[PDB]
Every structure is written in structure tokens, then in C-alpha cells.
Symmetry: D3
């Protein structure tokens, strides 16, 4: 029923499995359109819990935002109706829990996507990287905020400023992951927890989830502060460095950033 | 001088011990009113630190809200002057440190109560559960907010959406607990910390505790957002699921939740 | 060049070494003025990352706020223009990452200073304490807020109410520190990470740092609540206890606090 | 095409005329559902400006909330999905200007409804009253806020505390109305302005309307404050006085309020 | 029963008449303490509306803050527990409408006091001046906020930057006053309105006043911004100019301000 | 001296007169850069009050934003460092009162500019229009906020949705202006007020001006609401209507807006 995802229903749990292996489940507009369609189709009282996953044995869970779909320069790369912006809002507003079940490496926007979900259960061999400083991308306020609700600020700044992968074991220690399991146990450990959640009161889960969403968003600022940040972001997406970051990825080389 | 608590004073440290074991120290109106009177009576310059505890050897620290006293009549069960709501505000505004010293199992409202205190020191055998999804209860914004200042969002959502107990060891790992001690060392570990705090400057403690309280509360939202959440909560406490949750608990059977 | 700091530039990384061992790198105005000038002078495109350190082998990283300079004539000791308040603003607003590379003991205002920095890498023998309750100091809102973005509320309250030192191992476990290494590896580990950061896109680093700063600050309150807190702080810095704390420190004796 | 409104379209201007004169255009659920359906049907690119009006010659523009549909005792009479609450939100979110063109007397909820619209043009004989204090109604935060964006606090508190009618001339003087015109010129004057607005850029109008909506709503408070206000409101809608106010209106007698 | 006020109650209305004309009803601690005790004594269910007035034929309604009680030698003149700050909070939180019935001239803190009240009815010969720039006083955030809810910013800035008296006619036109009437009608007009308000639902009045109070207060800012403003205010109350403003007032001469 | 403004000092008052009559004082980058330099040059203790004026006899006070300098499409026209955005911040943060003394017609950005000033004194023949809906411009949040602190919402929505001029008399009536005077009296009346202000306490004026600025900006919102607004603004500046509005102005014809 979808080109880019496969949905299986097990009792009251729906498992949405990525089927975009040819672009390593990059969050291209058409992939995200199918994932959002599949979530919408599952917004029914007989479904009580969602699992997001890559196919069994995947080396790459998701390669993150489709770098080819980023603008060439002079345009905001992460505007409100960008597909990554759409899917994080939809996950956060969805009235059922969404568990990210992670096998393989997770990159950039895909790391934000799983951080926006309710629980993360990961393989012992999974790895996690936050990548805008590799490309010169001015990440947006909402996107950064979605990275700050689990690990502390020092941990988050190390992840973003180094863009270095962290292990599942370190991700568990700093509070990013709920559980780390051997890859052979991942699917059944995650399904056991999803089935348990599915026996609980779904209207209580939905309103508690919404209350947590609203409290998590409730860091408020005045208009001048937001427009000041937007002007800083524009200077970045106008920079030579942003174009060097895009070109280095296209030419498969290490970018040379100079600070303009 | 109280029916439902025993108070011992050791120089500048006051220990408030639950005396409601008949009802597993459930947070009934008469128990909370005594606990609040005892705290009020200890608000004197000669007292510098409070310890809350269950009696030595308790299997159950507190069974949480008295489910007989939960409003069933399409009436908000966690309104501003509900005893649980009163005691958390009082604990948080109290100008001395309050340490929860936990032996036995902690449930629901009693988990929110210890989370509202300043430090938690627990026995290695103690266990912790947050239970509103078991009953279909739409936990209130302030109450949920009180669960979000220690562990991360993914961890909080696991605790609430599963309603599964966690060990003291996991509660320490995720940042809920300050210390975990062998049961036979719990009382003297907690007392030595309370005596030590009692040597420090009480006016500096009080103003710093109050500054943390107001920074912790300073997640702000507009009226529309609050009224929208209140409407969602009312749809939950009006639901058939909420009735089924209450009735199943009291009739000692598994509830059948349907999403209405 | 600078009287009170030494700067070594290695490729794109600047290492700022404290040179105030006379007062164990206490935050005297003359020392902070030199540190802020040295930071300002490093705000140039060819510098990509800063390390702050005490001299190799230091027993004391920083002894904290200069207690001789703390106002005890009954004015606010932590007003907006105080050296500690100035250096934390400058570190947070600095468009390059600032890593605190810690060897030795860290006290009070120096603990707030490293908490305000982006990443903290510490020696396994380093120790950390937050000390206002030893002196009767009413720590200000911004300074307390700077302590709340890494460890949870319960842990922060234990640190502040006890003013007890914690080990590097505990500071890592509770999420204050990024990494703990053997002293012999501290320069190698820290420089490797700083050089790595220095290959990344500096304009993306700067805007994301600023986004995190403004999100971190975005706990808002009304004027009445601020003026109320300021009145409570005044009552503390006018107290007999505050004079007793200051005198006790200068006379190298134990303060006796009485709650006025 | 509607039972309770009549819609006329003149180029880019739509006039929605009430057709509920046998209940004096009271804001009953059936009337408001037709009004909201008519607005939704007009959310089309070629419609640029809406006028809301009562029929020509109306003595009563609207008698406000249907007092027979106000919750009798114990339920919030002004919950998020109450019809008055739904229509003010829809008017304010609607991406085209909505002009209230007022002939006759305006009461209670209907006064809040025209205040929620973008412009008010009124007959010289029109009158305005805000009536919750006649009935003992605890008007909700969003609804009170909707009355505060035109005239000052003192003038708003006079209107609500007295429940006395003001003339169109006073309503113009204090900043509630845009224009006052003789009743024979009201339709022509309002249509000329609507046609003129309709020549302007609709996407600029829509985004500026939405910017004003969000700035108007951006009075934020913490969860405890909202829950405290909700507890005060519940005490009022649980009061003897609230029952007495409803009873007195329906028995056409002077209420006897006693402050419980 | 009071030295500095006279209270008369008829039916459900109380009139608090100032009795401190030998000091032109200056807001000395002893006068504010009596006014607050009189209002506290009237917080009874049978009292439903308060009027504040000067005696019949007063030239000076209130000469404002007693300049003799303004702190010199570097304390904040408008700290949270200053009598003017206490009375404005008490009026705003008082669960009954408070009408200011004004005959004569209104100065400085007394202008803030009447602005904090619910309605102002004034004689046609009344005059109003806001005076901090006369004395070099850094008016506090709450106090300035209390002046912004009636007239627009440009008008408020004219009143403050000029310190020039405005007529009752102009005060009515700009939205500061509810009504202006000839002196001989002032008491009859105000009593008619107070007695009319006292027949309305008191619990509805109280909750709506409190909702307006919290919405009015709900302009929120971060800790840094409040601390930055406080540093600015301290520099002013530490200034040459502030000492010169007070000295000039008490020596009955014109200050020479120099901007230090 | 300046190419595009003329500055006169009279005692402690500085008058900045526009000298760009060949472009009807349009807010070009070269003009704004000169006005800002002149303002910065006058930030001196011997200057107490600023007046902004057009030359005596001007038909046009300012034609507003230089339409030639708006970016053609796909670019935000009112970014943080746009000249209009810069000048309004600088006027608002300027520690001396700035009085707009208006002869002639005021358009668009020039209307936002005088609104951002402290007081407006205008000739009886002056006229005022706010014009973004003539051109299809998505005005920014800060810009709109600057139009909301004087007149009420219904009045501001009329001015913006119609783009029709208002007279000085109506602008006085709705709270936009301080004073309207005959053109022959304008200069003398404005100078007398400016000289009067110049004898008051400048430090008190500066801190109260800054308090008002921050209270004025203190309408706060979460990141998502800001980014949702920016997405809407970008849909407008990407629109065919935006291109049509600019092309119509250039080609001197009536635009044909279609809603995309
Ligand atoms: C902008 C935001 C964002 O999400 N950016 C994307 C962040 N993602 C990344 O940085 C991952 C970039 N890719 C990689 O590091 C490697 O391709 C990955 C994931 C490790 C796996 O390496 P492999 O050697 O197995 O495969 P290989 O290098 O040959 O690539 C296979 C084909 O897929 C392509 N590819 C990979 N990632 C992306 C992507 N994110 N967007 C678009 N295309 C992608 C890659 O270029 C290659 O294409 P072909 O050469 O045409 O076959 S931000 O950075 O968070 O701000
Ligand atoms: C509503 C909020 C809240 O705090 N709800 C309450 C959450 N509390 C719980 O879920 C704990 C429920 N109870 C249990 O799990 C077990 O009773 C525990 C506490 C482990 C005790 O086990 P035991 O085997 O020793 O005793 P047993 O199950 O036989 O129960 C003995 C009698 O105590 C009763 N009881 C227990 N808890 C409560 C309660 N919270 N309110 C009212 N009654 C309670 C239980 O019904 C039984 O009563 P009898 O039938 O008279 O023997 S919320 O959920 O957080 O939103
Ligand atoms: C107010 C905020 C704050 O930052 N308070 C300060 C917190 N700092 C402290 O508690 C550390 C106090 N210092 C010490 O305990 C000792 O100096 C420690 C670190 C244990 C090291 O002992 P030593 O015997 O090795 O060194 P010694 O005591 O002789 O000091 C060397 C010279 O520097 C001086 N010194 C030290 N600390 C400070 C300080 N915080 N402020 C001002 N001066 C300090 C110390 O007095 C000595 O100077 P001389 O006696 O003149 O040689 S708050 O508390 O966070 O609110
Ligand atoms: C909850 C909010 C709200 O909007 N409350 C309702 C506010 N509306 C009012 O207070 C209007 C009350 N009614 C009146 O003042 C008069 O009925 C009105 C509008 C002036 C016109 O008087 P008339 O002489 O032409 O007709 P008359 O008074 O005899 O009543 C005709 C029949 O209609 C009825 N009626 C009127 N208004 C309402 C209403 N809002 N809800 C329900 N019924 C209403 C009135 O009771 C009478 O009924 P019958 O005697 O059976 O024919 S609140 O108050 O703002 O909080
Ligand atoms: O005497 P006041 O004018 O101060 O107030 P009060 O309500 O007693 O009397 C005025 C009469 O007019 C009525 N009124 C209320 N609101 C409106 C309105 N929006 N348009 C027209 N008339 C209005 C109000 O009901 C009152 O009439 P009665 O209740 O019959 O005494
Ligand atoms: C500090 C805040 C505040 O509320 N400041 C106070 C603002 N109040 C004023 O500026 C009013 C100052 N006073 C005057 O303008 C005149 O005294 C007024 C009130 C018009 C009355 O004129 P009169 O000719 O009838 O009486 P006269 O000028 O000779 O003074 C009578 C005696 O009372 C004294 N007086 C007056 N006002 C105050 C005051 N606010 N605090 C302390 N004393 C005051 C005045 O100095 C004179 O004193 P003696 O000659 O010693 O009997 S602030 O400025 O808003 O921030
Ligand atoms: C975008 C923001 C903004 O500030 N927009 C600009 C708003 N300003 C306007 O709409 C005013 C546009 N101009 C007019 O209304 C009239 O040109 C004005 C002030 C009344 C004077 O008309 P007159 O008949 O007296 O003289 P006339 O029109 O013949 O002289 C016109 C020459 O000057 C030019 N002009 C005028 N205004 C501007 C402007 N704002 N930017 C650029 N050029 C302008 C106009 O195009 C014409 O040029 P030439 O005749 O070709 O030399 S927004 O709209 O607030 O968002
Ligand atoms: O007259 P309306 O108010 O109904 O709108 P409309 O713009 O069509 O009519 C007025 C004419 O005056 C113009 N206008 C716009 N803003 C201003 C201003 N601040 N000062 C002077 N004139 C202004 C507006 O361009 C319109 O011009 P024309 O369409 O050429 O008649
Ligand atoms: Ni927060
Ligand atoms: Ni406001």
C-alpha cells in the first residue's frame, strides 16, 4: 500500500519499516510523505502503539535529511514545511506512543527524528551522529530544541560541535536511549514493551503525551530574539561555507571551511 | 500529637514518619492533612532539614492516591485543592530542604510526591511506578511537570506509558535518585546528610531553593494552550475508560480499555 | 600579552592557561579582566576552538570568587557587572566552542564558570563543589540557572545544599562532565577533540551555540516574580548570617549560622 | 443552503446574515454550527472579506449565549469546545478580514464575538453590554483576554463589573468600534470598505492578521497559575450564586447573590 | 478605629476617606499601613465595592510618596516591601472592585495607586502628574507596568518624560479615567455606580478581576533581562542626580541634573 | 556633517532634519545610515532630547521604504539587519527621548519609524498610512508589534487592511499622536516640550524608557509558533502576488492580486 514503507500489524501494535534502502532511508520528501500517510492511516482506535524501524540487518538506519534536497544557498534549508520539520511535528502530536527501534547508524535529521519519538530502543552495535557542522547547515531553533530534552547541554554540544558518532552504550549512559539490547533480541524486546503499553488506557496516554509536548515546547522568547536568531541563520545559509559544505558532499571530499 | 504521622527531632533535623500502614500510607485526605500540619509545625528557625520516611521495614512506602477518594462523577480528580496537589506545592515552597528517604515500593501520586522533594535517598530494594495509564487518569500539567526535572523525556515517557516499576539501581542511573544504600545503612546515611546540610546557611538555602522552584515552573504557555489541554483532560475524566479503570482497580480485575 | 593568563595557539586551537596561582586562580577582577581581554582578542576567523585550563599539575583549578572582593557592605554581591557574571555571559555569547580542561579542585563561582562553558573534560583526580551555603551568599537567578542544564534538580540541590565535593567519576555519571581521563592523557584527549571541532563549519557552530544559549535562558517570569525574588535575596545579603559567613571565611573558622 | 444564516457574495465580499430572529440570534449550538459551516464554505481564494450582520431593522443583534444551553451546575459553562469558544477561535484564525456590522443591541458572548472580529462598524443606535456578573458566570481566561485589546483595563472593568450598556458613541470614544454611522448608511458604508480591502493583497492581509493574533495571545503564564485560576473558576460554577443567577434569568426576577 | 482613614459603610459599599490632609495624604508608611488594615477589615462577604477618596473640597488628593521616607545611601527606593509596592499589590489582589473617586491633584506614587485600582471617577478640576524624572527616581518594572494598561505608550512616555500635569478632560480622552463629572456630582455619581456594582454576582466579579490581573501581569522575560534592568536601576539610585533630586525637593529649590 | 540629514543643537536639544527631499525622504540604506550616524553622534551627556523632522513646508514627511531596495522575490524583505529594522531598534534603545515632529504625509515604514519613537507631535494637515497590503509585503512580527502599543487592535487592523490614510485628528483620537497643532505653531510647541524634558533627570528617563521597551517586547511565544509564522511569511515573499505588487508600483498601475 506504500512505495517507501512496509506496515505490519501485530495485535494492537503497528510496525512501520523503512523501504528506501537504495538511498539508505534518507528522509527525502517522497519517503516522508509515505511515512506520514502510513501514520495517518494508523490513527484508529484498534492501533495503540507504533514502532519505527529499518529492515532487519540494516547497516544504516537512516542517512538523515536528503542532502540533495537542501537548497543551493540563499534559502532557509529547514523551513516549517521541510519534510524533516513535518515528520517531527507529526510524531510529537500523534496520539499514540511511537517507539524508535534502531539497528544501524543514525545521522543528522534522522537523529532528530528518533529524538522526537517517545522511546528509543537500540541494538548494541547502533551508532548516532548529529551532522550540521559537517555541511555548514544552520539548524533551526525547533530542531535544536528537540535534541535538548534527554541529555544535558554539555553532552548535546559535544555531539553537535564534533559531529562524532557515539555508541549505543554511551547514548544509554547520557540519557538518549531507553534500552540497549543485542541485535538478535531487539525486535522481541521492543514488541514486548509495545504490547504492554497497548493494554494501558489510550486516552490517558494521549493527553499525557500532549501535556509533555506542550511543556517541552514552553521555552518562550520575544519576537526580537527570534528575528535576531533568524538573521544569524540567514547569514549562515548565505555564506561561502554553506556552499562549500554542499559542494564537498557532492564531490565526495573533505570541506575546507574558512568562516565566511 | 498527630494521628497519621510520628515526628522525631534530632537537633536541627526533623524526621516525619508515616503512621498509616493499615492503608499502605495511601495519600487519603486525612493522611495528607496530618503530613501538612506536621510540616507547618516544623517551619521554625531551630529546624534546618526535613526527612520524610515510611516506618523501618515497610514493604510499601506509599500506595499513592487513595483510589476510593478519586472523583468518579465527571469531576477533575487532580484539581488545584486536591490533597496531592496541596502537598507537592507545600513541599516545593517549604523554606528548608525536604529529603525523601525511601524503603519499599512507591506508586503513582506518591512517586510525584517524592519527585517534588529536594533529594531522594533510597534502599537498594525500593521500586518506583507511575500508574495513571493503569486507571485511565488524565494527570494534570503541574503534576506531569513535577516528573520532568530529573530524568529525560524518553525515560519519563517509558515510566508513564508502561506503568512498569523500575529498580532503585535504574532510578539512580537515570537521575531520579541521589543515592542508593543497603537498607541497614539507609537511616544513618540519610541522617548524616541531613545533619551536614543543617550546618549550612539557612537563608541562602531557602532563597536558592525558591529560585530553583520558580525557574523550574517558568515553562510558560498562552491561555488558549492551557484551555485546550483542560478540554482534552475533561474528555478523559468523562470517558468510559476512566470509569472502567476505577472499577477494575476496586473489583481487582484487569481493565478492558477501548478508547471511549 | 597578559599579566594573568598565558595563550598558546596550536593550528586553530587557542589554549588559555590561568596565571594567577598566587590566589589559586580566584576570580579577582584583575584576573577576569585579563581572561575576557584574551578571549576577545581570540575572536578572529583563524581561531576555531578555545581551551581554558589551569597550569599542568595544579592542585587547585580555581578557588572560586575572590572573597576579599565580594561586597559585604550590604550590597548585592552578584550584580550584573560583577566579574563572575561578566565572564559567564562572555563565555556563553562567544561564537567559538570553549572547552574547560580541568585538573585540580573547582570551587563555587569557578564551578559556575566551567558549567557555563560548552564542554568539560576533566582529570580522574579533579573535584567539584558549589559553595554559597558555606558563606550565606544568596546566589542570583542567572547563576543558579547556569547550574541546571546538565544534571537533574535533585542532584543540583544535593550539590548546593551540602556544598560537598564530588569526584570526577560522579560528575560524569550525573551528566556534569563530557569525559574523565587519566591526568597524563588530559592534554592529548582535549586537543584531539578541539582540533577535530576546528575542522567543522564555524558559522554553523556559532549559530547553533547561540540557539542553545537562548533556548537555555527561555524560562520566563513576570516582573512581580523577579522583584519578589530580589527582595528575598536582599534580606539574605542584609542578614547577620551573611556577615558571619564572610568573617568565618576570612578568620579561617567554621561559621555558626542562626537564620537571621 | 443553511437553516440559520443567509449568505450573499458580491464579487470578493461575502455577507453572512443571521437568520435566528425567533431566538434573537442567541449563540445556540445549532446557530453557531451553521455560522461556522458558512465561514468554512467561504474559505476560498476568490473570497477576500467577510461581513457578519443581523437582518436590516434588527432590535437585537444577538442576545448572546443561549442561557438554556449553559451547564446548570458543576460543569464548566465556557469549556474549549463550547460554541462561543469555537466561533471566536474560528473568526480569529480565519485568513480573511471579518467585519462585524452591528445594528441593534449586543449582549454577553455576542459582545465577545464581535470583539474577536477584525473591525466593528455600528449603527448610531446600537448598544453593547457584557453580562457575566448578572448571572454569576466565571468568564474564562481566553474570553476575558479577547475583551482587552481595544479599550483600556479601567474601561473593560467598568463594562464587566457594571454590566451596563454603552452607546455606540461611547464604544467609539473608548476604542471598541472603528466607525459609527447612521443606520440607513450602515450597509453601504461597510460594503464600500469591504470592497476596498478586497483589492489589497490577500496573502499579506492573512499573514499580518495571524501575526496580530499570535502577538495578542502572547501573554504567557506557568501551569500553576492556570490551574489556580481554573480552581477559582470551578468554585464559582459550583456556587449557589451561579444557580441563583441562572434561575433568576429564567424566572424573570432579580437575583439574590450572597457570595457562596 | 483608624488614625489616618475614616471608613463609612452603607448596605454593601464602603468608602475609605483619607484623614492625613496635614501631610496632603502623602503615602507615608503609617498612612499606607492604616489604608491596608482598613481594606483587610473590609474583606467580608457583605462588602461588595470599595471607594477610595480624599475629603470633600481637597486641593490635593495625594502628594504621593513621602519624600522624607525615600531611602538615600544606596537602597532601592521601590523594593518589593516598600509601602507603595505593598498597597498596589493589595488593591490588585483584593476580591472586590476598588473605585478611586478623585478630587484635587494626584502626584507620583498616588497616580500609580489610582491606576492600580479598578475604576477612576474624577472631578472636572482634578489633575494628574507622574513625577520620577523630577527627583531622579528609577521607577521599578512592576510600577511602570501598572501605568501601561490604559493609555498608549506615546501618552505614557509624555506623562513620565515631561512630569507635566494633565487635566481630567485629557486623562478621560487618552483612556486613563472612566468618567469626569462636575465636583458637586462626584459623590452622587460614584455612589450610584458602587451601589449598582454591589447588586451583581461577587464571585464572578472576583474571579474576573483576578483573570484580568494575571493577564495584565503576563508580560514575561528571562532572568538575564531582569538582572540587566536591575543593574541599570542600581546605577540610577547610586547616582549624584538621585541625591540632588531628593536634596532639591527638601531644600525647596530646582534640581540641577547632570547625568551622573 | 552628513549628506542626507542636517543637525542643529539648541541648548540641550538636537534637531535632526531630513535632507533627502529629492526622494521624498524615502528610507534608503544611504539615508538610514546617515540618520543612525547622526543619532550615535548625539549620544552625549550635553544632549538631553532629540527631535526628528522633515524640512519646514514638506508635503511628504517620508515616502517610507525605498521600493527599489526591496529584494525581488524568494528573499525576506524585512530581515533583522534591513535598514528600517535597524533604525527602529536604535530609536527604541536610544537613552534620550526621541520626538517625531511631523509635517506632511507619512507612509509605511516611515509610519513604523515614528511609532517606534517616544512622542509624536504633528501638524493638523499631516496624514498617516500603513501600506504593506498595497504591495503584498509580509510585514515582520517585530514591525507589526511596534504598531500595536498606542491604538487598539480593531483600529490597527483597519489601518493595515485598508492601507487608507488617516488624518492627524483621527490619529490623535485613537491614541497614535500626542498633540496636533497648526503647522505655524509646530516647531515652537515641539521645542518648548523638548527644552522642558531637557531639565529633568536623564538617568531616570533612560532607565524608564528601557523598562518600557522591554515590557513592550515581553509578549513571548515558543519556537514553533515563530517558525510557523516565518513559513507563512516566506510563502508570501515567494508568491506571485508579491512580484505583481512590486511590478505594479514600478509600472505605475493598479495591482491585480489573485491569492497565490
Ligand atoms: C542537513 C541535516 C542532515 O540530516 N544531513 C544529512 C546527514 N547525513 C549524513 O551526513 C550522512 C552522509 N552519508 C554518509 O556519511 C555515508 O553515505 C553513509 C551514511 C555513511 C554510509 O556510507 P556508505 O559508504 O555505506 O554508502 P555511500 O557513501 O556509498 O552512499 C550511498 C549513496 O547514498 C548517498 N547518500 C548517503 N547519505 C545521503 C544523504 N544524507 N542524502 C543524500 N544522499 C545520500 C551517497 O552520496 C551515495 O550516493 P551515490 O554515490 O550516488 O551512489 S544536518 O546535517 O543534520 O543538518
Ligand atoms: C491515581 C494516581 C495514583 O496514585 N493511583 C494509585 C496508584 N497505586 C497503585 O497503583 C498501587 C495499587 N496497589 C498495588 O499495586 C498493590 O496493592 C500493592 C500496593 C503492591 C500492595 O500489594 P499487597 O499484595 O500487599 O496488597 P493488596 O494488593 O492485596 O491490597 C491490599 C488492599 O489495599 C488496597 N489498595 C492498595 N492500593 C490502594 C490505593 N492506592 N487506593 C485504595 N486502596 C488501595 C487494595 O484495594 C486492597 O484492599 P482490600 O480489597 O480491602 O483488601 S495515578 O495513577 O498516579 O494517576
Ligand atoms: C561566593 C561564591 C564563591 O566562589 N565562593 C568561594 C568558594 N571557594 C572556596 O571555598 C575555596 C576557599 N579556599 C580554600 O579552601 C583553600 O585556599 C584551598 C582551596 C583548600 C587550598 O588551601 P591552601 O592552603 O592550599 O591555599 P591557601 O588557603 O593558603 O590560599 C592561597 C592564597 O589564595 C587565597 N585564596 C584562596 N581561596 C580564595 C578565595 N576564594 N578568595 C580569595 N582568596 C583566596 C588564600 O587566602 C591565600 O592567600 P594568603 O593567605 O594571603 O596567602 S559561592 O560560594 O559559590 O557563592
Ligand atoms: C454567558 C454569557 C452570555 O452571553 N449570557 C447571556 C447574555 N445575554 C443576556 O443577558 C440577554 C438577556 N436578555 C435580555 O436582555 C432581553 O431578553 C433581550 C435581549 C434584551 C430583548 O428583550 P425583549 O423584550 O425583546 O424580549 P424578552 O426580554 O422579553 O425575551 C424574549 C424571550 O427570549 C428569551 N431570551 C432572551 N435572551 C436570551 C438568551 N441569551 N438565552 C436564552 N433565552 C433568551 C427570554 O427569556 C424570553 O423568553 P420567553 O419569556 O420564554 O419568551 S455572559 O453573560 O456574557 O457571561
Ligand atoms: O442602569 P445601567 O444603565 O447603569 O445598567 P442597567 O442594566 O441597570 O440598566 C440599563 C437597562 O438596559 C439594559 N441593557 C443591558 N445591556 C444592554 C445592551 N447591550 N443594549 C441595550 N440595553 C441593555 C439592561 O437590561 C437594563 O434594563 P433592565 O434589566 O430591564 O432594568
Ligand atoms: C518619588 C515618587 C513619588 O511619589 N514622589 C512624590 C511626588 N510628589 C510630588 O512631586 C508633589 C510635590 N509637592 C508639590 O508639588 C506641592 O507640595 C503640592 C502637592 C502641589 C502642594 O502645594 P502647596 O503649595 O499647597 O503646599 P506646599 O508646596 O507649600 O507644601 C506643603 C508641605 O508639604 C510638603 N510636601 C509636599 N509634598 C510632599 C511629599 N510628596 N513628600 C514629603 N513632603 C511633601 C512640602 O515640602 C511642604 O513642606 P513644609 O514646608 O516642610 O511644611 S515618584 O516621583 O513618582 O517616583
Ligand atoms: C514596503 C513598506 C513600505 O514602506 N512601502 C512604501 C510605502 N510608501 C508608499 O506607498 C508611498 C508610495 N508613493 C506615494 O504614495 C506617492 O509617490 C508620494 C509620497 C505620495 C508622492 O506622490 P507625488 O504625486 O507627490 O509625487 P510622485 O509620485 O509623482 O513622485 C513619485 C516618484 O517618487 C517615487 N517614489 C515615491 N515613493 C517611493 C518609495 N517609497 N520608494 C521608491 N520610490 C518612490 C515614485 O516611484 C516616482 O518615481 P519617478 O516619477 O519615476 O521619479 S510597507 O508598505 O510599509 O510594507
Ligand atoms: O481614501 P481611502 O482612505 O478610502 O483609501 P485610498 O488610498 O484609495 O484614498 C486615499 C488616497 O491617498 C493615498 N494615501 C495613502 N496613504 C497616505 C498618506 N499617509 N498620506 C497621504 N495620502 C495617502 C492613497 O494612495 C490614495 O491615493 P490614490 O489612489 O492615487 O487616490
Ligand atoms: Ni526548561
Ligand atoms: Ni500586552
Amino acid at each position: 500500500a506504500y512505495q517507501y514503507v512496509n506496515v505490519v500489524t501485530i495485535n494492537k501494535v503497528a510496525v512501520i519499516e523503512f523501504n528506501y534502502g537504495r538511498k539508505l532511508n534518507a528522509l527525502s520528501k517522497v519517503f516522508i510523505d509515505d511515512l506520514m500517510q502510513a501514520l495517518s492511516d494508523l490513527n484508529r482506535p484498534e492501533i495503540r502503539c507504533i514502532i519505527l524501524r529499518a529492515p532487519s540487518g540494516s547497516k544504516v538506519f537512516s542517512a538523515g535529511h536528503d542532502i540533495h534536497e537542501l537548497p543551493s544557498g540563499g534559502r532557509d534549508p529547514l523551513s516549517y514545511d521541510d519534510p524533516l520539520r513535518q515528520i517531527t511535528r507529526m510524531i510529537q502530536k500523534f496520539p499514540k506512543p511511537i517507539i524508535s527501534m534502531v539497528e544501524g547508524s543514525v545521522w543528522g535529521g534522522a537523529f532528530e527524528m528518533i529524538m522526537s519519538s517517545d522511546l528509543i530502543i537500540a541494538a548494541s552495535t547502533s551508532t548516532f551522529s548529529m551532522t550540521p557542522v559537517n555541511l555548514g547547515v544552520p539548524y533551526n531553533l525547533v530542531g535544536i530544541h528537540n535534541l535538548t530534552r534527554d541529555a544535558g547541554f554539555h553532552i548535546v554540544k559535544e555531539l553537535i560541535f564534533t559531529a562524532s558518532p557515539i555508541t549505543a552504550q554511551r547514548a544509554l549512559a547520557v540519557g538518549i536511549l531507553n534500552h540497549v539490547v543485542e541485535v538478535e533480541e531487539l525486535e522481541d524486546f521492543t514488541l514486548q514493551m509495545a504490547h504492554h503499553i497497548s493494554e494501558k488506557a489510550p486516552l490517558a496516554i494521549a493527553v499525557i503525551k500532549e501535556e509533555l509536548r506542550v511543556l517541552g515546547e514552553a521555552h518562550t522568547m520575544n519576537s526580537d530574539e527570534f528575528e535576531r536568531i533568524q538573521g544569524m541563520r540567514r547569514a549562515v545559509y548565505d555564506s561561502e561555507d554553506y556552499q562549500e559544505g554542499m559542494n564537498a558532499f557532492l564531490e565526495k571530499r573533505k570541506p575546507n571551511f574558512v568562516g565566511h
